[PDB]
């Protein structure tokens, strides 16, 4: 519920010692957390937001040249000069022409020449930047209350949201019923601002990093304009033509907007038409759920006569979702729900919406289950009206495990070392695992930086060839430690 | 699939890659046929009008 | 003296009348009346429902 | 009980409004006003002139 039908769910099992679990959660996915004797909750980061932006440097896109003046001089008599040349709002470049008696000069040589133009901008690109504080996240918290119209209905009163700020980052959620959940984020070690420039076009907005933003050949001016008129690298957007070694001329270059849209190939788009709402990134959030009860214990098993008002209809990575309607007596009650089979009776199939509860009897309650990899049966009622429904699930035996492995390597490729903080404190293995992933990531960094889609594939096959044709059993280390990994990363980049 | 007055029960992937000018199922006003070139041909016999 | 044009390219365009249409899974493709006229630019993609 | 159509293949059709347009060599390829519709099936080919 609020997690159903989103194609990225990432079920989190169990809890370790004191009742806390460690999850990383991002904008694309939403996390379903299952515990032993605790309700299952659904977590979803919905809104990253920068709050106080301060502009760093603004580029120009389309400019305009007026007041073109020029000045030449005799060939041996040095170099020309203008008082417009020392003005910073004029662009100049020395060259030379041919001079003689036809040019009214004498001495028949190559005289110098200057040319000016008043560089005037009319389309800016304000690159704003923010600090890691006042960066206010927002996470919705929602339980698996078996409750009408709530499975994917991502609106309304179907959950409680809390907001995370890096100077006050506990802010527990008193969600109705079920007790009260706490969580301990770490948003400072997330996307790592002070290295991120919120670039801004007229209406569109991007999210680029600093050193790319500072190295663009395009005329610039600092964050305070105040009759700016002092564009710095003006030569990148004018060009001076000297045809035939006769007179020379100055022309502007034109609109750099579409070339800038080609420049941003690999920049995640955000919006800042109102606010500075990012919709990308993640944060490592330690979910600490101590005082989280069930809302429905000490109820009684039902009398019977359930009926189904919406069919089985399994989700992706199949977990079925059935909506049932109760009629009868004893209206607060526990639904006798169980996934099992035919004769020589066993039980097989986990229940995800733990302890489903009928309240306010004339209101349907939607239960979600988890069937096994073959054929199974769905039993709901008890003595009369034994609601027995069939369901068949394709494959789900080895394709589930290799699909879990591919989600694990993809989650470990998109997120860095933080993907090791997705489990419930493995102790030594998680810590040395992310320690070796920090060392191997820092050595994988300061390499493959600026390398694109095809180039790390090419360097991957030319390092895998060296891996195959080596000696001294350096084969496996140079093959599987760097080679095949850079192949896989070469495939999975450019999301 | 249902032709004029008969009917058959065919495979799906066999049905989708069937070379004929098709149209989506939710398409009212069925004018925008898609691969129309599988039911027309262009006679350019010599180097003259086609 | 007398030039004849060969091919006209676009430089700066604009998109008005943004229309979209989606349909439930495992039941074909969406159909839309503006796919017929070729001023409209189109692309099919996959949402999850 | 309740079917959902996903694709409509056609069987028999007909072609009306047959129009053509050519253009002198090396000055590009022609253009016709009803090429803009996707009812009109089109093909470009070379004639000698």
């Amino acid at each position, epitope marked *: 519920m609020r997690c159903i039908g989103i194609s990225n769910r990432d079920f989190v099992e169990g809890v370790s010692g004191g009742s806390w679990v460690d999850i990383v959660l991002e904008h694309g996915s939403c996390v379903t957390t299952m515990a032993k004797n605790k309700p299952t909750l659904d977590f979803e980061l919905i809104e990253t937001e920068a709050k106080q932006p301060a502009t760093l440097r603004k580029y120009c896109i389309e400019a305009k040249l007026t007041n073109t003046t020029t000045d030449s001089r005799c060939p041996t008599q040095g170099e020309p000069s203008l008082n417009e040349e020392q003005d910073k709002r004029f662009v100049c470049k020395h060259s030379m022409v041919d001079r003689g008696w036809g040019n009214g000069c004498g001495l028949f040589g190559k005289g110098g020449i200057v040319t000016c133009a008043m560089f005037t901008c009319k389309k800016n690109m304000k690159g704003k930047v923010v600090q890691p504080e006042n960066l206010e996240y927002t996470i919705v918290i929602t339980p698996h209350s078996g409750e009408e119209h709530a499975v994917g209905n*991502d609106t*309304g009163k179907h959950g409680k949201e809390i907001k995370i700020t890096p100077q006050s980052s506990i802010t527990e959620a008193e969600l109705t019923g079920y007790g009260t959940v706490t969580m301990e984020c770490s948003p400072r070690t997330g996307l790592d601002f002070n290295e991120m420039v919120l670039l801004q076009m007229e209406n569109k907005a991007w999210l680029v990093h600093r050193q790319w933003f500072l190295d663009l050949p395009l005329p610039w001016l600092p964050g305070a304009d105040t009759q700016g008129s002092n564009w710095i690298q003006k030569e990148t957007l004018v060009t001076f033509k000297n045809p035939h070694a006769k007179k020379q001329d100055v022309v502007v270059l034109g609109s750099q907007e579409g070339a800038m849209h080609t420049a941003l190939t690999g920049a995640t788009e955000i919006q800042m038409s*109102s606010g500075n709402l990012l919709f990308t990134g993640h944060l490592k959030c330690r979910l600490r759920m101590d005082k989280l009860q069930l809302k429905g214990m000490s109820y009684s098993m039902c009398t019977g006569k359930f009926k189904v008002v919406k069919e089985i209809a399994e989700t992706q990575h199949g977990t079925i979702v059935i909506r049932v309607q109760y009629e009868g007596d004893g209206s607060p009650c526990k639904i006798p729900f169980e996934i099992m089979d035919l004769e020589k009776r066993h039980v097989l199939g986990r229940l995800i919406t733990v302890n489903p509860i009928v309240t306010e009897k*004339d209101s349907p309650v939607n239960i979600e289950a988890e069937p096994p990899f073959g054929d199974s049966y769905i039993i709901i009622g008890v003595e009369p009206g034994q609601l027995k429904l069939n369901w068949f699930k394709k494959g789900s035996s080895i394709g589930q495990m290799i699909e879990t492995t591919m989600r694990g390597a993809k989650r470990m490729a998109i997120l860095g070392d933080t993907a090791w903080d997705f489990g419930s404190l493995g102790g030594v293995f998680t810590s040395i695992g992310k320690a070796l992933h920090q060392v191997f990531g820092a050595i994988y960094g300061a390499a493959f930086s600026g390398v694109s889609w095809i180039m790390k594939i090419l360097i991957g096959v030319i390092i895998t060839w060296i891996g195959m044709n080596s000696r001294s059993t350096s084969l496996s280390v140079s093959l599987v430690l760097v080679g095949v990994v850079t192949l896989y990363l070469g495939v999975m980049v450019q999301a | 699939l249902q032709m004029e007055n008969k009917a058959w029960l065919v495979h799906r992937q066999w049905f989708l890659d069937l070379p004929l000018p098709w149209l989506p199922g*939710a398409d*009212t006003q069925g004018s925008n046929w898609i691969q129309k070139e599988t039911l027309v041909t262009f006679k350019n016999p010599h180097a003259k009008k086609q | 003296k007398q030039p004849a044009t060969l091919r006209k390219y676009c430089i700066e365009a604009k998109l008005t009348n943004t229309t*979209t*249409d989606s*349909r*439930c899974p495992t039941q074909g493709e969406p159909s839309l009346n503006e796919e017929q006229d070729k001023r409209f630019v189109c692309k099919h993609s996959m949402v999850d429902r | 009980k309740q079917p959902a159509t996903l694709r409509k293949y056609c069987i028999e059709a007909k072609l009306t409004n047959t129009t053509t347009d050519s253009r002198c060599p090396t000055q590009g390829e022609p253009s016709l006003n009803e090429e803009q519709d996707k009812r009109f099936v089109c093909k470009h080919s070379m004639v000698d002139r």
Partner: antibody
Amino acid sequence: EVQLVESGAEVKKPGASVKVSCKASGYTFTSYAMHWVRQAPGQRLEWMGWINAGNGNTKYSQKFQDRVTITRDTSASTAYMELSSLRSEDTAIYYCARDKVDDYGDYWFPTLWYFDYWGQGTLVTVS
Amino acid sequence: SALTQPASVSGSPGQSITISCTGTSSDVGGFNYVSWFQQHPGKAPKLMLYDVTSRPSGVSSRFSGSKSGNTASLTISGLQAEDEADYYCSSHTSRGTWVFGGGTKLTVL
């Protein structure tokens, strides 16, 4: 707790433009869509509907696509209805219709319910 | 692009009435976005149904709906005197627009 009041009009003339408004109370304005529904006397309830949001990106109608535009403002929490080029059949009872926006700011799909709460209706007439 | 629920139906108090509504495959034949309304003649139309079988808070369990393809049927079991009002259907098309029904006038006496 959720109340939607509106602003009525007495009588209009064909060739003019009418501007009916509506105040939203009990809930915030930034994450809620607010549609528009006709009701001609003894006729089908036609759809003026405007998918407003906190940003203002709004789809037209289909019958009335190039005939009517609207405005809005957040500080007054009022969605307007500027019906231009009035005719003889444009007399109806206009309703404002509450609707809920997705939590990602955009309005791609509407919710499972549409119209939990309504305006009282403004019976406009032409003359 | 319009819904075709009939003109008027009637039934004695104690019986059950059925109100049907047929539409295209773009709003009701594929999607579950079907809802119902209670337009009293001196009141704004009140929301009586959510999604095809669902129901708002405050609405009694007397009202129930169904869908059998292109047809969405509304069933009122055990009519009373407080049902003498119009009933308007609704559907969200795949295009993005909403269409409403013509209107059924219900009488019990």
